């Protein structure tokens, strides 16, 4: 009792029903996978920038 092995028939129709949406891009993407020596300094840089802006517009 052999049967059909594999096909890709109807698959693109199924995809293009409500399919091929591009992913939503955002301002400020995720920083995971970025180098830890860069992120460790970036935290302190933004902390100092926020403190300077708070002291400027306090």
């Amino acid at each position: 009792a052999k049967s059909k092995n594999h096909t890709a028939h109807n698959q693109t129709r199924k995809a293009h029903r409500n399919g091929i949406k591009k992913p939503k891009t955002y301002k400020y993407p995720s920083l995971k996978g970025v180098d830890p020596k860069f992120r460790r300094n970036h935290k302190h840089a933004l902390h100092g920038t926020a403190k300077a802006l708070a002291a400027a517009k306090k």
Binding site: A15, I20, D35
Partner: protein, 159 residues
């Protein structure tokens, strides 16, 4: 059985080329990548470390991470019915800058220059590109260009 390894069906894809084998030139090591650059991916078979997979050959992506000898690139891969985000760590021998991006930036700076110079007069800048318009009227003359009559040629064997 079947065989789907990591470098299956990559024979002509990862051959080097004709008469440019050997070591790689130093421009690929002297080129500088920053975060947000748009790069093309083309693997170098002479360098076995930091190789991309065969799917990403000829793919174009965006730099998100810069390390000592490699670059992190973001690709959008169609999986099923949507695109997924893929992060790749590739050595710099397998990437180069995309020239379309720098062409577009040249268009941006020349376009801003045109707008800046024509803002002093207000002459309807018309900064959008336009495609190939139909060609307009013209008068072609026969002075020294009298028409030559052509006819179909009869059949011959020609062997």
């Amino acid at each position: 059985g079947k065989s789907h390894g990591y470098r299956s069906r990559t024979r002509y894809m990862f051959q080097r080329d004709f008469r440019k084998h050997g070591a790689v030139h130093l421009s690929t090591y002297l080129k500088v990548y920053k975060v947000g650059d748009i790069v093309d991916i083309k693997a170098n078979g002479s360098i076995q470390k930091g190789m991309p997979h065969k799917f990403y050959q000829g793919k174009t992506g965006v730099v998100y991470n810069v390390t000592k000898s490699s670059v992190g690139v973001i690709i959008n891969k169609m999986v099923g019915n949507r695109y997924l985000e893929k992060r790749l760590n590739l050595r710099v021998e397998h990437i180069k800058h995309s020239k379309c991006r720098q062409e577009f930036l040249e268009r941006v700076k020349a376009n801003a220059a045109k707008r800046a110079e024509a803002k002093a007069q207000g002459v309807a800048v018309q900064l959008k590109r336009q495609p190939a318009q139909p060609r307009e009227s013209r008068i072609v003359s026969t002075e020294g260009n009298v028409p030559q009559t052509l006819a179909p040629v009869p059949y011959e064997t020609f062997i």
